[PDB]
Amino acid sequence: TVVSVDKDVEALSFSIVAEFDADVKRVWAIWEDPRQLERWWGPPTWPATFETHEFTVGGKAAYYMTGPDGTKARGWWQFTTIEAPDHLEFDDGFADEHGAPVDELGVTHATVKLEPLENRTRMTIISTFESEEQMQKMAEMGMEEGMREAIEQIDAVLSEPANALEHHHHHH
Secondary structure, eight states: OOOEEEEETTTTEEEEEEEESSOHHHHHHHHHOHHHHHTTSSOTTSOEEEEEEOOSTTOEEEEEEEOTTSOEEEEEEEEEEEOSSSEEEEEEEEBOSSOOBOTTTOEEEEEEEEEEETTEEEEEEEEEESOHHHHHHHHHHTHHHHHHHHHHSHHHHHTOOSSSOOSOOOOO
16 A cells, blocks of 8 residues: 655654554564565565564664665664554664665664554554755665555555565556
8 A cells, every 4th residue: 555655854754654454463463573574674676584583672683685686785673662563663774785884874763653443454654864964865765765665565465465576566
């Protein structure tokens, strides 16, 4: 899906609203299970792979997005607030070939909120950046668009039609 996309540069936040036919724990399962997270983490062309995923308050996660050419782009993750089954908070971090925080792109704190629609659930992920010139550079990378494409591939995780996704996503 992705039913709405909101961006506020004054408050340094970038929110994506999406709505899925599943319960709050079923949509939470993509966050709780490392294997179900890397299933959609990053765009269709760059699927991630989590070496570790603690999923605890003050715990971390290590991953890398495997490119279409094989180009391996590392990233690091840190959990700040895990309430369950609705409220989650963490920090999306990029990592270089050694695993150091990419100061080119900085650090961004995303807040995942699940809403019980009886038999369905709506998710809203708000990524907050350290500065304006940082969040402009995130938009220059196209991180905001590729993030949406990841959340549209969540629909492929929770539905899973007859192939999940053959990479038919051909539009920007």
